[PDB]
């Protein structure tokens, strides 16, 4: 009896995944202090 | 394809909207800050390290 | 999903052999059952009036 | 994610269809300039220019393979419906002569009084 | 003003003196090969289809196998499809091979 | 309708346009295989094999005549914008040489530093 025999049968074993916190960093609007907004829907 | 949305567990329109928003914010930063960077500054503006 | 999970189970096999004085008892083993696999398909048609 | 805490591998999911192919951007050459809604042959692509390009800039050509109305035909020749159309890049005009011109379409409506042709654009071969 | 006037999925033609077309059949009229959406008479205006789409038809020469992928040529003299590749006009490529009922699925081509 | 009360007569209305025909089903032969979003020539049809197939399986090829991002070219050749594209079925790579290869497209964006190309797909002639 050895765990190595049943290692390949992944469906028998409990599946645990370690959290990594992977993704894409948020992209902020850095240009706001410099510019003067002119919002008009008929330019 | 409809099959990709319906059968794929993780795929969704939410991640597509996230990608759209991220690229949009980066586009805004580029549009409103690349004129500042790419400009050919004359010697009047430029200041040395000193 | 388009392909269904396969049910699994673990089963322990053993056999009783009657023991005489001074023979090592043979040990059993373990076998794993596997269920069937089902698949989901997409059917479609339509008209162009 | 710069400075991520764990070396997460990245797997690219392949993709082929980049766009619809209705139109294509093209860079103007030196001795070229385009105005809107006129046919041109720029870098091997024949289509209707959708922007006014002046020099060394980027313009979009429409290659939709749809039906197009166009002036700018060699009025000496008569364009009956069904005849193949060719593009004379030297004269910048449509013609039925197949000497070395580029095949670009087939006529639907014959040559009318106003030198106007309705023709079906071709697959850019 | 716009150069594009219509999507080009269909094209109008005028029937000559030796041409007559019935609904939903293939006809080579004035260099355009398509499916006529109207039953036409001499000197009448009809509309053909050049939609580059998959089309069904049994109007074929029943002598040679139309295995999938082979080019389909339209013989105006006999008014039939065939794989001769002679001076007959090229019109499509077979998607689904011929069945026992002599039915073909093929993709139209851009009239070049 | 079997066993109908009355001898009715059924008249068919003909319909030629079976389908839009933007893609075509095809069956893999012995010496052919596919994986998703890769270009292939199968049974005279050239397109993007949208599904995996190995042996006698059914796969579908995109023939939309849209713009496609491919890579997978003969790297030694130069691919300027507008140049015609040919598929070398022996090498299973795109190329501009027209020796015995199928004409399949025209480049919209030239060969970049990583051999990527955008090109219009052609009507499978």
């Amino acid at each position: 009896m050895t765990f190595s025999s049943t290692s390949n049968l992944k469906e028998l074993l409990r599946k645990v995944v370690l959290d990594v916190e992977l993704g894409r960093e948020q992209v902020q609007l850095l240009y706001k202090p410099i510019y003067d907004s002119i919002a008009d829907s008929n330019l | 394809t409809k099959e990709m949305k319906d059968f794929n567990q993780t795929f969704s329109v939410e991640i597509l909207n996230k990608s759209i928003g991220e690229s949009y914010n980066a586009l805004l930063n580029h549009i409103h800050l690349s004129p500042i960077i790419n400009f050919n500054y004359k010697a009047s503006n430029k200041t040395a390290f000193k | 999903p388009q392909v269904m999970d396969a049910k699994w189970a673990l089963q322990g096999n053993c056999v009783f052999l009657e023991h005489i004085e001074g023979e090592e008892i043979k040990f059993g083993t373990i076998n794993a059952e596997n269920g069937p696999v089902a698949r989901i398909q997409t059917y479609a048609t339509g008209f162009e009036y | 994610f710069k400075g991520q805490p764990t070396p997460s591998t990245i797997t690219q999911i392949t993709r082929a269809k980049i766009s619809d192919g209705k139109s294509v951007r093209v860079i103007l050459s030196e001795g070229e300039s385009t105005k809107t809604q006129q046919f041109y042959l720029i870098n091997g692509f024949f289509g209707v220019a959708m922007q006014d390009g002046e020099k060394g800039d980027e313009v979009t050509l429409q290659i939709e393979q749809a039906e197009y109305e166009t002036d700018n035909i060699v009025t000496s020749e008569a364009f009956e419906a069904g005849k193949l159309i060719y593009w004379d890049n030297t004269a910048k005009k449509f013609t039925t002569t197949s000497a070395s011109n580029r095949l670009v379409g087939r006529v639907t409506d014959g040559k009318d009084s106003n030198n106007v042709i309705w023709f079906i654009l071709l697959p850019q071969q």
Side-chain angles (χ1 to χ4, degrees), chain A residues 24-31 34-35, chain B residues 19 22 25-26 28-29 31-33 36:
Chain A
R24 301 269 198 73
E25 60 268 56
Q26 201 196 8
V27 169
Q28 295 93 19
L29 295 174
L30 305 164
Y31 81 103
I34 291 154
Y35 279 71
Chain B
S19 278
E22 266 187 10
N25 287 7
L28 263 67
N29 288 343
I31 287 162
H32 298 85
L33 302 174
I36 293 165

Side-chain angles (χ1 to χ4, degrees), chain D residues 37 39 48 62 64-69 81-82 106-108 118 120 122-123 125:
Chain D
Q37 309 316 129
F39 286 84
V48 173
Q62 189 165 234
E64 192 163 11
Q65 313 203 36
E67 188 174 38
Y68 296 101
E69 180 177 4
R106 192 189 282 279
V107 185
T108 71
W118 289 10
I120 305 300
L122 273 165
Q125 295 170 359

Side-chain angles (χ1 to χ4, degrees), chain D residues 55-111:
Chain D
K55 157 60 192 72
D57 53 306
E58 202 164 5
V59 69
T60 70
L61 284 158
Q62 189 165 234
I63 59 183
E64 192 163 11
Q65 313 203 36
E67 188 174 38
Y68 296 101
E69 180 177 4
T70 192
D71 57 50
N72 201 44
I73 51 160
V74 291
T75 192
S76 71
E77 270 160 287
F79 297 89
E80 303 89 355
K83 303 300 302 315
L84 295 173
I85 290 279
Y86 300 87
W87 177 252
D88 196 346
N89 196 20
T90 66
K92 308 299 183 63
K93 289 184 187 296
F94 287 111
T95 187
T96 59
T97 53
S98 70
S100 293
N101 295 321
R102 184 205 182 75
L103 168 50
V104 293
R106 192 189 282 279
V107 185
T108 71
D109 187 6
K111 165 161 172 59

Side-chain angles (χ1 to χ4, degrees), chain A residues 9-33:
Chain A
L9 316 182
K10 304 298 185 50
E11 293 288 341
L12 312 181
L13 321 182
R14 171 152 163 260
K15 180 62 179 153
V16 189
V17 288
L18 60 94
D19 202 347
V20 169
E21 199 265 307
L22 59 88
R24 301 269 198 73
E25 60 268 56
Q26 201 196 8
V27 169
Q28 295 93 19
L29 295 174
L30 305 164
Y31 81 103
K32 283 289 197 184

Side-chain angles (χ1 to χ4, degrees), chain C:
Chain C
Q2 66 158 14
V3 60
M4 298 289 284
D5 56 277
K7 305 179 193 184
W8 274 79
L10 190 68
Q11 291 158 4
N13 312 137
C14 73
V15 62
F16 284 96
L17 268 56
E18 304 285 35
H19 176 253
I20 60 170
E21 291 177 350
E23 78 175 344
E24 287 187 37
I25 291 159
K26 315 307 187 293
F27 299 112
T29 60
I30 307 98
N31 266 308
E33 171 172 306
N34 180 16
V37 179
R39 160 165 285 98
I40 313 191
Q41 296 139 305
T42 313
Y43 300 99
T45 196
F47 294 86
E48 186 182 40
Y49 61 93

